[PDB]
Design a protein around this ligand. Structure first.
Ligand SMILES: Nc1nc2c(ncn2[C@@H]2O[C@H](COP(=O)(O)OP(=O)(O)O)[C@@H](O)[C@H]2O)c(=O)[nH]1
Ligand SMILES: N[C@@H](CCO)C(=O)O
Ligand SMILES: [Mg+2]
Ligand SMILES: [Mg+2]
Ligand code: NA
Length: 404
């Protein structure tokens, strides 16, 4: 008595409207999403009639003066078999369904003219939404999303935007004990996606129901930033998300360097092997007060003469890495710099890893010390995972946020 494709569309709407995450449609949200769908307040008497019909026709359809899912599914079923499908359709089309009961294309991905070089970030409304969503599906209240709670959150989506086991836990700040995604790591992962894939982050906000909750296009969730000259506008379009590429020889200890951004104690990453290749790592640092998100993409270099794609070169700040305890290491950094970054406008910081080990001579012509002196570069930064200091990451973010 109710089509299967309609049940799937009604089971999503219920979850989106379940703002308390108690599997019930309480009095408040029902009246709220009545204005969202019909731009009129829900009359107090009609709600009683609804809750009277549901309770008498459906077993446990009304729980604690609130509508359950089976009560919600029955009501719209009752609407259709009484010649009132336009009431259900108004709800269905508000949550972005067409006549084929599938998500509308213009509803999922609205047109966004994004200038070349301009970055895309989460607006305040976008962050406020994603925080609210995090709270709803964090049932245990540990301030983290378990793999169970994560799947339940993206049960209203055709699929998760990322894996849980091989992505969000291995690329974002997680809880040390439970090993689960905290609110911070949750916001970090969305920040990453928003920057590198806008049409995807908006697509998923629609499934989650940002367009219904915020009562606006998901364009209101997206903030387009751009580094400009001195402007006297009222809207501060200052960036807050910077992408940092980490280049250098293989085994120079930069893969573990990126992963150390996420953990408090980086010392455990020494003997640990990385059985899952992660492209980008993201975390938040403080740069002169303002919160700043930095992305660390590690790019290994096999052969010295092997070319680098412009997608690998172009970034906000290049972190050239050499193994300080290796004589044959620095040679790669020299080549990469002179070829791609010497005549560039991208800030670049040379980092010598494994400074806990004995700093050796370099079999190159120039040593890292005077190599920077020749090209007016800041002196090489000695990095170690045993030191456990986040000073390097904050400088990387600082170099991206400021000249030169
Ligand atoms: N002593 C020391 N060894 C390190 C450090 N970082 C990485 N390593 C070593 O580097 C090896 C892993 O290399 P990896 O980071 O995967 O190479 P990469 O992907 O080119 O950066 C491990 O066996 C560690 O012993 C460090 O800060 N200190
Ligand atoms: N569809 C609900 C309101 C929105 O959840 C009703 O009319 O009962
Ligand atoms: Mg939890
Ligand atoms: Mg590597
Ligand atoms: Na609710």
């Amino acid at each position: 008595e109710l089509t299967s494709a309609c049940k799937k569309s009604l089971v999503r709407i219920f979850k989106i409207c379940d703002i308390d995450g108690d599997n019930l449609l309480n009095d408040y949200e029902l009246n709220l999403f009545q204005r969202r769908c019909f731009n009129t307040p829900l009359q107090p008497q009609i709600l009683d009639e609804v809750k009277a019909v549901i309770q008498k026709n459906v077993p446990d359809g009304i729980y604690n003066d609130a509508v359950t899912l089976k009560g919600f599914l029955f009501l719209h079923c009752l609407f259709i078999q009484r010649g009132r499908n336009e009431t259900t359709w108004a709800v269905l089309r508000r949550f972005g369904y067409n006549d084929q009961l599938e998500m509308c294309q213009e509803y999922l991905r609205p047109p966004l003219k994004i200038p070349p070089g301009s970055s895309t970030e989460l607006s305040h409304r976008g962050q406020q939404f994603l925080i609210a969503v995090f709270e709803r599906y964090d049932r245990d209240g540990d301030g983290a999303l378990s793999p169970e709670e994560h799947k339940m959150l993206f049960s209203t989506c055709p699929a998760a935007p990322w894996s849980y086991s091989t992505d969000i836990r291995k690329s974002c700040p997680i809880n040390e004990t439970t090993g689960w995604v905290t609110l911070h790591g949750w916001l970090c992962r969305w920040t990453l996606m928003t920057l590198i894939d806008v049409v995807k982050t908006m697509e998923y906000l629609a499934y989650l129901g940002f367009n219904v909750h915020e009562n606006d296009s998901q364009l209101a969730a997206i903030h387009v930033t751009r580094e400009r000259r001195i402007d006297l506008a009222k809207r501060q379009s200052s960036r807050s998300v910077y992408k940092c590429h980490v280049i250098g020889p293989k085994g120079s200890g930069k893969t573990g360097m990126c992963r150390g951004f996420l953990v408090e104690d980086m010392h455990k990453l020494i003997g640990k092997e990385f059985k899952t290749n992660v492209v980008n790592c993201i975390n938040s640092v403080q740069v002169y007060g303002q919160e700043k998100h930095l992305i660390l993409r590690d790019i290994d270099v096999r052969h010295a003469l092997d070319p680098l794609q412009p997608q690998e070169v172009n970034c906000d700040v290049a972190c050239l890495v050499y193994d300080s305890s290796n004589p044959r290491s620095f040679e790669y950094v020299a080549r990469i710099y002179i070829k791609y970054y010497a005549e560039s406008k991208i800030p670049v910081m040379i980092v010598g890893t494994k400074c806990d080990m004995d700093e050796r001579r370099q079999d190159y012509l120039m040593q890292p010390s005077e190599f920077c002196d020749k090209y007016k570069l800041l002196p090489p930064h000695l990095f170690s995972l045993k030191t456990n200091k986040k000073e390097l990451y904050t400088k990387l973010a600082t170099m991206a946020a400021f000249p030169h």
